[PDB]
């Protein structure tokens, strides 16, 4: 993405931005899954009727991962749009 924002580069015109954009999205997607997967598991932990309030505290880190992952995704999206615009300009 850094090489694709003008340079000094790339020398992969646009194409690079599209690739970079997907990678950020995938990165975000992976992050969303990992956080969720980890999260899903703890909530189920039946223990067992008078908890969950109660029970534990949870995330925590999750929250951050919940925010960080989201942020990452957003960034990826932005990158993708940038590449798209670049592509448009070339055409």
């Amino acid at each position: 993405g850094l090489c694709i924002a003008a340079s000094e580069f790339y020398k992969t015109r646009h194409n690079i931005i599209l690739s970079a954009g997907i990678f950020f999205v995938s990165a975000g997607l992976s992050n969303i899954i990992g956080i969720i997967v980890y999260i899903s598991a703890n909530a189920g932990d039946p223990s067992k009727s008078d908890s969950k309030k109660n029970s534990y505290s949870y995330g925590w880190s999750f929250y951050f991962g919940a925010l960080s992952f989201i942020i990452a995704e957003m960034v990826g999206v932005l990158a993708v749009h940038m590449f798209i615009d670049r592509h448009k300009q070339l055409t």
């Binding site: 999206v77 993708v80 749009h81 940038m82 798209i84 615009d85 670049r86 592509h87 448009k88 300009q89």
Partner: peptide, 27 residues
């Protein structure tokens, strides 16, 4: 090109806010 991505992101967000044959985005 940057605004063209904003107008589209708002269009896909409208295609998101729920309700041709480009097989890719079709499925």
């Amino acid at each position: 090109t940057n605004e063209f991505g904003i107008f589209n992101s708002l269009w896909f967000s409208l295609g998101a806010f729920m309700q041709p044959r480009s097989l890719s985005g079709r499925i």
